[PDB]
Design a protein around this ligand. Sequence first.
Ligand SMILES: Cc1ncc(COP(=O)(O)O)c(C/N=N/C(=O)c2nc3ccccc3s2)c1O
Ligand SMILES: Cc1ncc(COP(=O)(O)O)c(C/N=N/C(=O)c2nc3ccccc3s2)c1O
Ligand SMILES: [Cl-]
Lengths: 428, 428
Amino acid sequence: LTPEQIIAVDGAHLWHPYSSIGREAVSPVVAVAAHGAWLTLIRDGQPIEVLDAMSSWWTAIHGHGHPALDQALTTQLRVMNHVMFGGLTHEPAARLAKLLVDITPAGLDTVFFSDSGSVSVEVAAKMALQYWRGRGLPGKRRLMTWRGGYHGDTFLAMSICDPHGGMHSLWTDVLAAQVFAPQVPRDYDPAYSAAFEAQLAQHAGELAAVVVEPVVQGAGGMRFHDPRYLHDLRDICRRYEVLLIFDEIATGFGRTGALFAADHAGVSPDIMCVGKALTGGYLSLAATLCTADVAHTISAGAAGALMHGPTFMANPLACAVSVASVELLLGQDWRTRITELAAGLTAGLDTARALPAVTDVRVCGAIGVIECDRPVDLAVATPAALDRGVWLRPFRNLVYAMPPYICTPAEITQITSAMVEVARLVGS
Amino acid sequence: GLTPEQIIAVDGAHLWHPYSSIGREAVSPVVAVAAHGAWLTLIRDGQPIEVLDAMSSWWTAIHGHGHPALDQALTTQLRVMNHVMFGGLTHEPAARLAKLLVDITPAGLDTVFFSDSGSVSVEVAAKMALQYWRGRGLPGKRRLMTWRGGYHGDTFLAMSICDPHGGMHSLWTDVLAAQVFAPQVPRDYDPAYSAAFEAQLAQHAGELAAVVVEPVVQGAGGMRFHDPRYLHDLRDICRRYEVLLIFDEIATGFGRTGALFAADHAGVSPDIMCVGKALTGGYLSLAATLCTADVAHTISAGAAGALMHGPTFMANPLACAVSVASVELLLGQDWRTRITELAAGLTAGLDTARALPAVTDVRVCGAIGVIECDRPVDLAVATPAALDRGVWLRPFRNLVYAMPPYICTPAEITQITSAMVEVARLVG
Ligand SMILES: Cc1ncc(COP(=O)(O)O)c(C/N=N/C(=O)c2nc3ccccc3s2)c1O
Ligand SMILES: Cc1ncc(COP(=O)(O)O)c(C/N=N/C(=O)c2nc3ccccc3s2)c1O
Ligand SMILES: [Cl-]
């Protein structure tokens, strides 16, 4: 198909994320290639090279078409595409589980593979519910979180999305009613943790788990909070016997400057979700990890098993590329790489602070954010960024980037320059 | 790298399996080291042995594993573009696949929402149905209706429409949405069943968004078949009472029941349809939810303005690319004759099981063969007996069953059926 033909088919038959059919303000742009940190897009019938500043929604940590990941895939493809995980096991699943259990916060000893982040969140909730049922306490079945969060689009996942301002707001009426603490602030305030404890205390007998994104809240507003809050959550959850779940689907694999965001606080959750960058952005895969204690309690319960099992569970292809992606990350000095990236983003975005429409500029590891004083118009922002050789996808009032770790200093500055110019257009 | 013994050690300590325990498994999983065509290479007492994939790795491996055309499609796409975000971008694999799916599915299904698993595709279908009625100013239409015996996945919404017994709803007291269940649909056509279904629907019509069913064949919930005329009745009932009809063809799709889609046996189109499993030829997790122009426009013209769903890896180029190849390979051969031959092979091979003491039913529908027993099939007895005969079989409850790859030769079908008959013989 030609780019024109692709556009015609797409307009007629393809639903896009959080979109309409036939009522799109803009057509999507045709992507024809991706190599390293660069995408080849079609603009006015002509191919153009642009930087993947979003890492394809925080997935492409090693860039696209990395030789190590490409070959990990083709090697596995030669041997075994897929087998059912019921009654069978395999090397890619075992290699990946071993890696994950070793590199995640201490105590996370068991791994349940699934095919997406949302599902891995549903699995985490199921683990928590079955845990308490295994303890003879089925009343512990609600979840508690703080505002500003996002955990996916399946119905249970939706129930812990930010209620007033989050994308799932119109659905309250049919969702499970969960417990919400106020928005966690950026700076550490002991009063916030005290209020969190007081609220949790009154629901403790009906709460299975606290579920949060640690340090960085992604899709709910690219907000950062002091890691000390995670220390407080761990303590509160311990004392009130509520499980603690960290959703690291966006924060995992070095993105915030530590291997996992929980590491900023030295905290171990009882249950943890990973996804996105897990596969280096080649294929959909996610994982839910839990402690031996959680695993044993579920396994000793009336169910005698965790009642979940997706068709493509532990897909060899996805696992094999993930093994390669994780090994590639661990085999380099990733901490220095992310520190250099963060410094690059900080230096490059500094000028944005002075712009009339900019309310905040913030950086955390390989995450750069310009917060504007109004919703960003994509019809203006998209071409402006493309004009400067960068693919940016603002959302709400945020112009932000989570670049591939392989971006050179020059490429980071190109990205931040495009961000600043988008922000300039917002205010003019 | 890990040896089979090392794999078992890692797996026992760290890996969850579908609907399994950690540390309380009756039998260790068997190490799978390769898969090619209709055959898996498994480790039995340290030795690699080749056995037939009688289940098609749970419906998925329709062209067998490592089909050269499907391998080549994946590697071709890998050299061009592994993945890009589907927010603001489109691409050829998504367009090519959407075009194919619209063309081959029951008439009227004009739009395609890609997701990363069957459960997610079912949640998307439910979301379409609920948002549809919100767009019609009828938000009270929020419940789902189904018949007993069904299975639609493991996420919390999907669980709510699973058979209450198969889905162990007794373990989920007041966590699941309470849906409307009709009695088990019978094998033979009885107008009284449909009249009763209609009367039950009628009294719930004002609070029902949709009827959701698996058409012709109920898979994971009991491998039951029903007369296609029941689907004709559902279409009519849903039409007259203004309730949407959703067919879940995640297991039945792509020729498995002897028609391209099971709905084709009835000459009916649903308002919303789910596909998965065989979609990718079993290479990778991908699913799709299709809906009519009416459904898509009613959602889009609603005050909400957008379907609030969008998985990170939506419309993954690699998965879409191998699916395009899998669909084209199916359509480019005389698949109808192939399935007819497979059905005949299964019928002939399983015929001797009818006379066995512990056998209550023997049934075949397209490339699906089932022996139902009068008691639970003992896995510790069933596995070695099938493995001796060069066949991987996975009985559950009282059922010994197969859904073989379409590429299976008459000799392989004879091998598969003989193993099934022997498992049934040992039950009695
Ligand atoms: C912390 C966290 N937990 C779970 C999920 C859901 O994972 P998944 O999409 O694989 O089901 C996610 C999903 N992340 N979503 C995205 O990064 C975005 N999707 C869109 C779509 C449209 C506009 C912006 C975004 S950000 C997540 O960040
Ligand atoms: C009609 C239909 N709709 C939706 C789903 C859910 O798809 P997914 O597992 O990709 O989320 C499915 C999933 N089917 N699952 C399987 O056939 C099996 N899963 C397991 C798990 C453990 C042991 C046996 C089986 S069979 C389905 O058949
Ligand atoms: Cl978007």
